[PDB]
């Protein structure tokens, strides 16, 4: 009984050392740099082939192909420049809350209530997209799949366990068990050895690939965290919560830097992305619009209002050309 | 026109055509969310129909294609994956009437099921009551009083009166009476008519505001 008291005491010591080593008062620091100004994204292309609600999209590293996941049981690889459907992929489970697209462009991963992250081979002989590896071993719904490599996929799930996998064998290289609530998001680092995760227990945990243990755990949100994403430097990330706030967490400082909230916004965040320079933070709400956020000012500076339902998925290209947001409006739209 | 090996566009239109065909074929069908809680007779009803995570069961009745989303395998938070299931025609719902003690970890099959039935996305929750006794529920309500789980009950302890009180409590769970209709059915044997009952409930669902773009509802 007393050891639990000592553990709570060390938790209090950790949070007191978090507060004590910080005297920045970041509201003073933030105002120094110039504002970015009203950034009028305009819907350049509208991608009209989904007959149902869509939950995830992922971009390519060539910044021209984007995969799109939808509840009618379809993945679409979507030539973004010309609005051509390359590779409509028929799923086995129509309940897919996540989607991934390999940096090599050879593979797509998606999963959901089927508790399986299926891996699909895009570039193959015999023509059509085949399913390569069904990754079984989770028991909850799969909320996020992300490729580290053509043979390393990191998945997070609603059984409170993130797992890293070897696609060739099909078994978990690592499991990441430190979350108590259902895990709702992931983000791979730019250097691809760290990855951060967000869960329903309002705690965001950094992880390692080889170590397999949570180095750090970030709190501050009061509800589920629905979407998480690294800053492109890799030394920070931002979380999207049902709290109706977005928080910018730095790995190395170990405190929340800025909160992205306004008084008018009430609904929950659903997807988060960053610009290539990292000056502007995408954020996609249930208010039917992607209010896009200056990362440094913590000020809204533009609205990607084009959707007739809640916007579920957001993605910025790797070169920074585009932002493609899909929604239960059933249409993905690249703004620019 | 600047289209040279843009038979990519022809392939994209062909994919659009196949998508429209599949989407129309999918929206022609009926989606039911089997939301009955644990230790009920959801297994019993799915064996009564013709028939690792979500378990989707499909069946045919009177030229109408059904799909049943038995989601009992998920132990996650129900808040996160239930908004996926909006737009279902009806929610099948099992309740085990007996529990042999609710005829609160013991008397689960009344108060926990009562606690389950809360509503945030609105549709006709076709609640099926399942005795789990053939006719034996008569002798097990003779043996133990039903006032154990329901303190305010003072009606007759026979079959029909107690069953009607349980039904009345389950409808009293509902808040918005005019929006949703809770189609209630108590049957354990069910040689037929549980197929007919879900058929009639989803028929009244697809009539109302699903085939009332015309006819103005």
């Amino acid at each position: 009984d007393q050891l639990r008291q000592e553990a709570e005491q060390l938790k209090n010591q950790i949070r007191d050392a978090r507060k004590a080593c910080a005297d920045a008062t970041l509201s003073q620091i933030t105002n120094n740099i110039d504002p970015v100004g009203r950034i009028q994204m305009r819907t350049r292309r509208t991608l009209r082939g989904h007959l149902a609600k869509i939950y995830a999209m992922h971009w390519g590293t060539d910044s021209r192909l984007l995969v799109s996941a939808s509840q009618d049981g379809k993945l679409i690889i979507w030539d973004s420049y010309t609005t051509n459907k390359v590779h409509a992929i028929p799923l086995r489970s129509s309940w897919v809350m996540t989607c991934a697209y390999a940096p090599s462009g050879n593979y797509v991963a998606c999963g959901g209530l089927d508790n399986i992250c299926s891996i699909y081979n895009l570039k193959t002989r015999e023509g059509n997209v085949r399913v390569s590896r069904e990754l079984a071993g989770h028991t909850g719904y799969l909320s996020c799949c992300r490729f580290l490599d053509d043979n390393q996929i990191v998945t997070s799930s609603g059984d409170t366990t993130c797992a890293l996998w070897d696609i060739e064998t099909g078994q978990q290289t690592t499991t990441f068990t430190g979350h108590t609530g259902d895990v709702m998001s992931l983000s791979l680092a730019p250097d691809t050895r760290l990855f951060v995760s967000g869960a329903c227990d309002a705690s965001a945990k950094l992880w390692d690939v080889r170590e397999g243990m949570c180095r750090q755990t970030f709190t501050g949100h009061e509800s589920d965290i629905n979407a998480i994403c690294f800053f492109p430097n890799g030394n920070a990330f931002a979380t999207g919560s049902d709290d109706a706030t977005c928080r910018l967490f730095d790995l190395r400082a170990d405190q929340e830097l800025m909160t992205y909230s306004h008084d008018n916004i009430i609904c929950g965040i659903t997807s988060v992305s960053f610009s290539k320079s990292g000056r502007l933070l995408l954020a996609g709400y249930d208010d039917f619009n992607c209010n896009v956020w200056d990362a440094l000012k913590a000020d809204r500076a533009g609205v990607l209002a084009g959707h007739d339902n809640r916007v579920s998925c957001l993605g910025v290209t790797d070169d920074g050309m585009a932002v493609a947001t899909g929604s239960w409006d059933s249409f993905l739209k690249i703004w620019n | 026109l600047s289209a040279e090996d843009k038979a990519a566009v022809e392939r994209s239109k062909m994919i659009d055509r196949n998508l429209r065909e599949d989407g129309e074929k999918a929206a022609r069908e009926v989606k039911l969310l089997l939301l009955g809680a644990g230790e009920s007779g959801k297994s019993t009803i799915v064996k009564q129909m013709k028939i690792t995570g979500i378990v989707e069961t499909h069946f045919t009745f009177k030229d109408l294609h059904f799909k049943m989303f038995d989601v009992g395998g998920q132990r996650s938070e129900r808040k996160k994956w239930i908004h996926c299931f909006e737009g279902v025609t009806a929610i099948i719902f099992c309740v085990a009437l007996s529990d042999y003690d609710l005829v609160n970890r013991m008397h689960e099959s009344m108060k926990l099921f009562d606690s389950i039935c809360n509503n945030k996305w609105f549709t006709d929750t076709s609640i099926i009551l399942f005795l789990n006794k053939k006719d034996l529920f008569e002798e097990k309500i003779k043996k133990s009083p039903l006032t154990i789980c329901y303190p305010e009950y003072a009606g007759s302890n026979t079959y029909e009166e107690a069953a009607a009180y349980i039904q009345c409590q389950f409808e009293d769970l509902n808040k918005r009476k005019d929006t949703k209709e809770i189609y209630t059915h108590f049957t354990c044997a069910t040689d037929t008519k549980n197929v007919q009952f879900v058929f009639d409930a989803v028929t009244d669902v697809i009539i109302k505001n699903n085939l009332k773009d015309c006819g103005l509802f």
Partner: single-chain antibody, 232 residues
Framework: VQLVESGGGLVQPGGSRKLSCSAS????????MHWVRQAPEKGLEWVAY????????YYADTVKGRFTISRDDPKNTLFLQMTSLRSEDTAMYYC??????????????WGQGTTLTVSSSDIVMTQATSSVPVTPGESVSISCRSS???????????LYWFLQRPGQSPQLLIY???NLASGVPDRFSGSGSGTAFTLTISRLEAEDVGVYYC?????????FGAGTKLEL
């Protein structure tokens, strides 16, 4: 992937014949089919092109309206129907997979080719030379020139490169003037400009002996160079 085709033989001039091509191993419903012919002493030249599921059909202007193409998509069988064959149709005919989307590699897989003998404004491709003498390990460059520049507004220079081994089928080496095909070694490369094209094979080895062919895909017809044959 295995494209086997039949229909070759000797036919009287003015007679009719239907070539067939039995695709066996791929999503033949999802592939554009071509046809390319080759006279026994001459180079390749295009014949026809049916799109994925007959959405768009072209023909060669030398045989426009006299040849007919037809795909049996559920049967997975490609036909070419020919009527009243002339003396210019002593040639051997190849089935050609192609598939078009962003990143795709058309003209990659070629059939075994069937031989057909009869009894008895557009782009032009210019070869560099008839032949180059060969020694293994020594780098050599093979060039073609075109009438019109091939670099479209896409940035996509529609230059292809091939190789028909002595007594074998062709294959694809460099598609769209820079990009390497799959199943071929990485020694090959392609450097191109507006109409100025070079195949920069380095570390020449055995089994690279044969005749190279260059093709344009900017517009129809598809025209082939004579190319070079690397032999001492």
């Amino acid at each position: 992937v295995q494209l086997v085709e039949s229909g070759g033989g000797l036919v009287q001039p003015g007679g009719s014949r239907k070539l067939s091509c039995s695709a066996s191993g791929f999503a033949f419903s999802s592939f554009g089919m071509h046809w390319v012919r080759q006279a026994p002493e001459k180079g390749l030249e295009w014949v026809a092109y049916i799109s994925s599921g007959s959405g768009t059909i072209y023909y060669a202007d030398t045989v426009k309206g006299r040849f007919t193409i037809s795909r049996d998509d559920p049967k997975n069988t490609l036909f070419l129907q020919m009527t009243s064959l002339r003396s210019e149709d002593t040639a051997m005919y190849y089935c050609v997979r192609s598939i078009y989307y962003y990143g795709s590699s058309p003209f990659d897989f070629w059939g075994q080719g069937t031989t057909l003998t009869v009894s008895s404004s557009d782009i032009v491709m210019t070869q560099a030379t008839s032949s180059v003498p060969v020694t293994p390990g020594e780098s050599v460059s093979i060039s073609c020139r075109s009438s019109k520049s091939l670099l479209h507004s896409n940035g996509n220079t529609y230059l292809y490169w091939f190789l028909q081994r002595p007594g074998q089928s062709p294959q694809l080496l460099i598609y769209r003037m820079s990009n390497l095909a799959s199943g071929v070694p990485d020694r090959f490369s392609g450097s191109g400009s507006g109409t100025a094209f070079t195949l920069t094979i380095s570390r020449l080895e055995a089994e690279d002996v044969g005749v190279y062919y260059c093709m344009q895909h900017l517009e129809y017809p598809l025209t082939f160079g004579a190319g070079t044959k690397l032999e001492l």
